[PDB]
Amino acid sequence: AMRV
Amino acid sequence: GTIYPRNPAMYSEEARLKSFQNWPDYAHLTPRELASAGLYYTGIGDQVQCFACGGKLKNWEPGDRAWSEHRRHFPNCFFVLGRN
Ligand SMILES: [Zn+2]
């Protein structure tokens, strides 16, 4: 997942 | 005391669970796993937020685990540092  | 959750409302695992009512069908991680890792749904795409640190995560990947994505992006979270 990644940071927004 | 000395720490404070970014979202006191989502302090309850049950309340975090219910936020996933409209979790989209392409999102492979379960509301159970996400809520258990301190995460609730923001209502936008597959974007979730930690009640404790306020960190936000999206674009989940096959094989991602909520805890390990939580920990690796926000290692100094009190919820992360308080689990076992
Ligand atoms: Zn956190």
Residue numbers in the entry:
A (entry chain B): 1 to 4
B (entry chain A): 151 to 234
From the paper:
XIAP (X-linked inhibitor of apoptosis) directly inhibits the upstream caspase-9 and the downstream caspase-3 and caspase-7, and therefore controls critical apoptotic checkpoints. The XIAP protein consists of several domains, including three zinc-containing BIR (baculovirus IAP repeat) domains (BIR1, BIR2 and BIR3) and a C-terminal RING domain. The linker region blocks the active sites of these caspases, while the N-terminal regions of the partially processed caspase-3 and caspase-7 bind the BIR2 domain in a peptide-binding groove that accommodates the four N-­terminal residues. As has been reported previously for other BIR domains, the overall architecture of the BIR2 domain is a three-stranded antiparallel β-sheet surrounded by five α-helices, with a structurally important zinc residue coordinated by Cys200, Cys203, His220 and Cys227.
Therefore, the structures of XIAP BIR2 with five different peptides soaked in and bound to the Smac binding groove were also solved: ATAA, AVPI, SVPI, AIAV and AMRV. P2 makes standard backbone-to-backbone hydrogen-bond interactions with BIR2, and the side chain points towards solvent. The only interactions are hydrophobic ones with the side chains of Asn209 and Lys208, perhaps leading to the weak preference of BIR2 for hydrophobic residues at P2 (see the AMRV structure), but explaining the general lack of strong preferences for this residue. The methionine at P2 shows how the side chains of Asn209 and Lys208 can flank and provide a hydrophobic environment for a longer P2 side chain. Owing to the large arginine at P3, there must be a compensatory shift in the peptide backbone in order to allow the side chain room to fit, since the Cα—Cβ bond of the arginine lies flat against the protein (as was noted for ATAA). While the P4 valine only needs a shallow pocket, the P3 shift is large enough that the P4 NH to Leu207 backbone interaction is lost.
